[PDB]
């Protein structure tokens, strides 16, 4: 009704029956429809691709998250070309004339794995069309083995249909280039600390793989531009570039999300940890992210970091502890340090003067009887409520690695059971490390590991995810009671 | 002695390399090359030329190579372009005219991180020399932002000195391209199984990020060339390329070393595990590698894989188990499977007909008393000797994930203490998983986790590393006794 040509389509197969001349307004109707729910820049491309390609039989792979494509039919970046090549090879072996296309953005194509994919495509020469949605120029892509066309108007649906119909029938790797158009957050706390530290230390260097702005570095980038390094969507280079700066006797800080740090794992291990280089990792979006665009949960960093020798891992419980730990890691010179904190605001904690925290020592917040709660991170307020309810001991462990071994053994000798709490996978996480300490000393005291379950957490609000997983005060108390039953 | 190397003996006596007359360098290269042969041989001329032109060790020379760079170690007696960029930026801000050079091999430059580094250098433009040692043109590197020189004769030392002299004074990123010239192993078991499987099934596809010395896929690459994919040193693309093939309804097998799988961690999580795609990971060089070449120990895969949901992790104890587990993972359709095995040969175990193993079930090998040993992997013969020594119960656990929870709990109820054994980091490893199970069920039975300690293992032979870490029968027994004292 409000969108006449859009009302006439219920599947992509019917769209291809429409006259070629009706596409321009079909795009406008689609664009305006999206404004009563952002990715509108790909409207014309989406229409042209589905009008030229025999979808869903033909495979269209999108590398942000294109909404127009989902309306007509019914995530980590830079993965489209790689999978697209595999799909293209499978389609060739299938031998049923199935075609493959992949759309990649101007940001995603800066990732190393996109270059690995383009290099491989240039060698084995799959029948694959790569569409670069930007926002000669193709000499680079021609050297990598692609037949390059463009730049073209990414908003001329009829020009795209014609170009795409042509390039769809061509053999080998094809490349089309189009042009289109508490209160403070922990990110703010980190950003303020950055500027504060750089203000009186010319050795500080800040590194981010693409400024999503979520890391809170806009002010720093403008106040200290000569010491701010946006390396594009290149987590691997970000970490090892920092290693080089540390080798040069500078003090690098890598601001990186927990989920995206997974991409730099090998560089953390063999370019930093093995060398004992004092790189400071400021790990944002740790734990439960909620609904932050297309950011996966920071579910695993306490697990995959703590098996690495010579890695310090800190988990602040409020914004003051976060500043203390950033300061501590920045001035720690024996090896790399990680400080992981969640998206969102803290508790309103009083920001105390900065001083290095004793390495590998927790803080007893409340002495109780019978059971002790060992907290790693920002769930401390929830644990505090439970500790008063159950009259339990409560410890802010501060350090996932090195653990406060002496305190763990003392707690085990004065309580009947322990409880560990973390916004991280139970498997291999901070609480698992507590188990290892007790077992190593032959201390058979039962421990309830509370954390993220062993499945990928769907998106939602931080509040309702925490409630669903039993990580609020009520859920933690219930888990303890049932476990002790 | 002087009779052999009169020119080389002059240098090392009083480190006068840069004092030698230009005319003597060709003879010094001959002597150095033959000196190494009497005990990276193709880098002799380059090494001499670099140390003759650059003011080392003040000027920083970084080797990102697939060999030990012995010529460099004699003349002198970080490892990536990324670090060289950081060092170059540090040298510029130091403002003492310090120079940075990086040598990179033709294999190493195929990595995504190398392209990430070259893209960044082309933007901020550091005073850096990159020397490509090609032992298998510049339009590509000039589009990336480098000033390209060559190709040049990598064995013409005088030609290199003259060229390096001019380039050392040029500003911005510089790129010099030089030209130089019955008891099977588990690698053999895997390669034979590939050929066996592909012979009666057209869905299998094998992927490796560069075929390295000691590869088991030589025969497979020749008998099934259209089903073998070498993607160069590109672990990220390898895994996501496999994902695409799986999406195309083929059955991909990724052959990758444990240490190098660290580079594709994010692709395993978000391109494979999250999607539940049935990719089989055949993980070679797991555990103690010894001195394969430039391969680090496979010390962490049982830790960083088992915290990922929907990942099956198997640890064969002999070559028959290895075949059964590859078969099991190949026909497992619900998600990815990983089979990790060490460098070297098996036990001579009888190869039985292939059949999928019950998922998450271990095998009781010996019934004892008081102590029960839970083995994960190829240390089972050592555990068997200990089990007979101490009259202990012995179990081949087979699966690191999912664990045989029922067997763990039953063992804990019939013994006073458990012991776990694995060739992997204790922290977060397979034994750590056993701890988590017992703790979750409130079973206060102590567990001795035996495995790799929390430090990086120095190079050595497999047999002597295992002995030094106490992973032989005698070392295991000593640990148990000391732990029970």
UniProtKB/TrEMBL annotation, chain B:
Q: Which UniProt keywords apply?
A: Isoprene biosynthesis, Magnesium, Metal-binding, Thiamine biosynthesis, Thiamine pyrophosphate, Transferase
Q: Which reaction does it catalyse?
A: D-glyceraldehyde 3-phosphate + pyruvate + H(+) = 1-deoxy-D-xylulose 5-phosphate + CO2
EC code(s) of this entry: 2.2.1.7
Q: To which protein family does this belong?
A: Belongs to the transketolase family. DXPS subfamily.
Which GO molecular function, any one, fits this protein according to its record? 1-deoxy-D-xylulose-5-phosphate synthase activity
Pfam families cross-referenced by the UniProt entry: DXP_synthase_N (PF13292), Transket_pyr (PF02779), Transketolase_C (PF02780)
Q: What is this protein called?
A: 1-deoxy-D-xylulose-5-phosphate synthase
* Binding positions for thiamine diphosphate per the UniProt entry: 67, 107-108, 135, 235
Q: What GO CC annotations are associated with the protein?
A: cytosol
The record's annotation in CDD domains points to: TPP_DXS (cd02007), TPP_PYR_DXS_TK_like (cd07033)
Query: NCBIfam families from the xrefs?
Result: dxs, PRK05444.2-2
What SMART domains does the entry give? Transket_pyr
- List residues of the Transketolase-like pyrimidine-binding domain: 184-349
> Among the record's GO biological process terms, what is one?
terpenoid biosynthetic process
Q: Which superkingdom? A: Bacteria
